[PDB]
Ligand binder design. Structure first.
Ligand code: ATP
Length: 144
């Protein structure tokens, strides 16, 4: 909470929050899950697969806030803020997946394919630390 976002990282915060609900629904569709009227895992139907508005707005807001907390954790571990270029921010590419893996909504099936992006071990350990901190947050939630 003591960490405050710089305004530029803050545009990127809301924009990547939209990117995060996109990634969440895309993980949901990568799981090969089914969409239905009722929110039951046992009968294997959930209407939380298509877009953010189809979700409960409070659930989407909590998704946004946990993405915000995840990037605040990224800041807390002390990552130096870096940006490639302004074009890579104004215009992001839209990879197309086949129709089978195409989302029912109008969003791009994924931001861009994992082949061209190789993530360095410096941030690989960074993600591990994110994993421990998220596990600790869930654990204190269970303790509460
Ligand atoms: N799919 C979701 N992922 C994360 N948070 C969610 C999700 N759906 C609802 N929430 C929000 O999270 C809170 C409780 O749901 P949550 O998913 O955290 O619980 P859970 O999966 O039953 O497990 P735990 O209580 O251990 O977190 C509420 O504020 C709720 O609005």
């Amino acid at each position: 909470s003591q960490i405050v976002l710089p305004p530029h990282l803050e545009r990127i915060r809301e924009k990547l929050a939209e990117n995060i609900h996109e990634l969440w629904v895309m993980n949901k569709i990568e799981l090969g899950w089914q969409y239905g009227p009722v929110r039951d895992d046992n009968k294997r139907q959930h209407p939380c697969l298509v877009e953010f508005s189809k979700l409960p707005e409070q659930e989407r807001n909590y998704n946004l806030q946990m993405s915000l907390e995840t990037l605040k954790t990224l800041l807390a571990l002390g990552c130096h803020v870096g940006i490639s270029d302004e074009h890579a921010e104004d215009k992001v590419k839209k990879m197309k997946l086949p129709k089978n893996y195409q989302l029912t909504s109008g969003y791009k099936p994924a931001p861009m394919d994992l082949s061209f992006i190789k993530l360095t071990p410096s941030q690989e350990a960074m993600v591990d630390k994110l994993a421990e901190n998220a596990h600790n947050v869930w654990a204190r939630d269970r303790i509460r």
